Structure formats: C-alpha cells, structure tokens
C-alpha cells in the first residue's frame, strides 16, 4: 500500500529552489523512522537535492530520462515505479511536488509534518480533500533548542 510522507510549512509549502529552508532535527528523525527499511519513491529533482542514496531503503527514481547512476533504480512511469517496488507492505513516496501529485490518488496513508513557519517557496503539496481523509495520529511539539519552530506530526489514512 502507498504512503505519502511530506514536510509542510505554512501554506502547504514544501520546498524552495530544491531545498528544505528550515532546520528541524526532530523532523529528520521521524522521516528516517517511517522510511527506513521501505522503498522510496522520488522525482529527479528530489534525487538531485538529496545528493546520494538513502541508506537502508531501495531508491526509486522517477524520471523520463535515463538514469545515470547505477546505485539507484531508474523508472519512467508511475506503474513501473510500483512494480519495481516488489510486493511489500509499504511504499514510500517522497516527492517532489509533481510526484506527490501523481501518487496521491493511489495513496492510502499520509505522513505529515506541519511546520509552523512562513517561507516563500515555489512548491506546494497537493491540496487533498480533507473529507476523504481520517487522522489517526497527531503529535504536536513546541519549539526548542534543537528545533527552531513548533511542529506537528500527523498521520492520515484514507477513509
Ligand atoms: O520538487 P520538484 O517537483 O521540483 O522535484 P521532483 O518531484 O523530485 O522531480 C520531478 C520530476 O521527476 C520526473 N517525473 C515526475 N513524474 C513522472 C512520470 N509520471 N513519469 C516520468 N518521470 C516523472 C521528471 O523527471 P525528468 O525531468 O528527468 O523527466 C520530473 O521533472
Ligand atoms: N516529513 C518529511 N520531512 C522531510 O524532511 C522531507 N524531506 C523529503 C526529501 N528531502 C530530503 C533531503 C535529505 C534527507 C535526509 O538526509 N534524510 C536522512 C535523515 C538523517 C537522520 O537520520 O536524522 C535519512 O537518510 O533518512 C531527507 C529528505 C521528503 N519528505 C519529507 N517529509
Ligand atoms: Mn474506512
């Protein structure tokens, strides 16, 4: 089953110029937790921002151009991407924006981190119709010495 994980700022802003503006240690932790051991899907842009392969997970890169790195798996389509995933309990769709757009409809569960902070960006997380989603988990966090802003981790499962 497919899951979308994503870090959202105010206004569903997800990123700016291929990078995550803010600095939130608690977010990386969580991200790493829910991703580790599962395949991860991502776009070319996201691949690039990342720089190298996420350890402990199979990297699936979705692009219309040939790969150019044999350490990761390159696929040209949403279906291909899923086949490459094999039969596993969970697939992790990590963005960018376009990607996430492609997978929402297939997605069953959403892993969201709402960040309290105004950033101007160029990308947004798709607008998903609340009505169809059920929040099964929530956890707020006041800012701190490591995390410069307050945040919320949230888990949403389709109805
Ligand atoms: O963040 P961001 O949105 O800027 O970056 P991102 O989502 O990490 O990168 C987006 C991209 O991934 C590829 N992609 C997305 N959907 C695809 C599909 N259905 N089939 C093939 N390739 C697809 C394209 O790569 P290519 O530009 O390499 O085709 C596209 O420009
Ligand atoms: N919730 C959420 N948080 C994010 O930070 C986020 N980032 C991406 C994509 N960009 C990136 C860029 C770098 C690393 C990264 O180095 N991840 C490490 C965490 C390091 C740690 O263990 O604390 C990893 O390998 O999991 C992750 C995502 C996608 N969804 C997100 N979704
Ligand atoms: Mn139900």
Curated annotation (Swiss-Prot):
Please name the NCBIfam families in this protein's record: PRK10769.1 (NF008037)
Annotated pathway: Cofactor biosynthesis; tetrahydrofolate biosynthesis; 5,6,7,8-tetrahydrofolate from 7,8-dihydrofolate: step 1/1
Pfam assignment, any one: DHFR_1
What is the organism lineage in this UniProt record? Bacteria, Pseudomonadati, Pseudomonadota, Gammaproteobacteria, Enterobacterales
Using the record's annotation, list all stretches that form the DHFR domain. Answer: 1-158
Which amino acids does the record list as binding NADP(+)? 7, 13-19, 45-46, 63-64, 76, 95-102
Known outcome of mutating residue 154 to K: In strain: B[MB1428]
Question: What species is given as this protein's source?
Answer: Escherichia coli (strain K12)
Tell me what gene encodes this. folA
Q: What are the disulphide bonds in this sequence?
A: none
- Effect after changing residue 85 to A: Decreases catalytic rate by one third. Increases catalytic rate about 7-fold
Gene Ontology BP annotations: 10-formyltetrahydrofolate biosynthetic process; dihydrofolate metabolic process; folic acid biosynthetic process; folic acid metabolic process; one-carbon metabolic process; response to antibiotic; response to methotrexate; response to xenobiotic stimulus
Key words, A-Z: Antibiotic resistance, Methotrexate resistance, NADP, One-carbon metabolism, Oxidoreductase, Trimethoprim resistance
Q: This protein is called what?
A: Dihydrofolate reductase
Documented effect of changing residue 20 to L: Increases catalytic rate 2.5-fold. Increases catalytic rate about 7-fold
Phenotype when changing residue 92 to F? No effect. Increases catalytic rate about 7-fold
* Binding-site residues, substrate: 5, 27, 52, 57, 113
What's the EC number here? Answer: 1.5.1.3
Function recorded in the entry: Key enzyme in folate metabolism. Catalyzes an essential reaction for de novo glycine and purine synthesis, and for DNA precursor synthesis.
**Which reaction equations make up its catalytic activity?**
(6S)-5,6,7,8-tetrahydrofolate + NADP(+) = 7,8-dihydrofolate + NADPH + H(+)
Q: Which family does it belong to?
A: Belongs to the dihydrofolate reductase family.
């Amino acid at each position: 089953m497919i899951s979308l994980i994503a870090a959202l700022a105010v206004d569903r802003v997800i990123g700016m110029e291929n990078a995550m503006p803010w600095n939130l240690p608690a977010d990386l932790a969580w991200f790493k937790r829910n991703t580790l051991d599962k395949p991860v899907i991502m776009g070319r842009h996201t691949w690039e921002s990342i720089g190298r392969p996420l350890p402990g997970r199979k990297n699936i890169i979705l692009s219309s151009q040939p790969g150019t790195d044999d350490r990761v798996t390159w696929v040209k389509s949403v279906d291909e991407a899923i086949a490459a995933c094999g039969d596993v309990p969970e697939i992790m769709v990590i963005g960018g924006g376009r990607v996430y757009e492609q997978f929402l409809p297939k997605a069953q569960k959403l892993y969201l981190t709402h960040i309290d902070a105004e950033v101007e960006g160029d990308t947004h997380f798709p607008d998903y119709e609340p009505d169809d989603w059920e929040s099964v988990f929530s956890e707020f966090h006041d800012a701190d010495a490591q995390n410069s802003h307050s945040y919320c981790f949230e888990i949403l499962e389709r109805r």
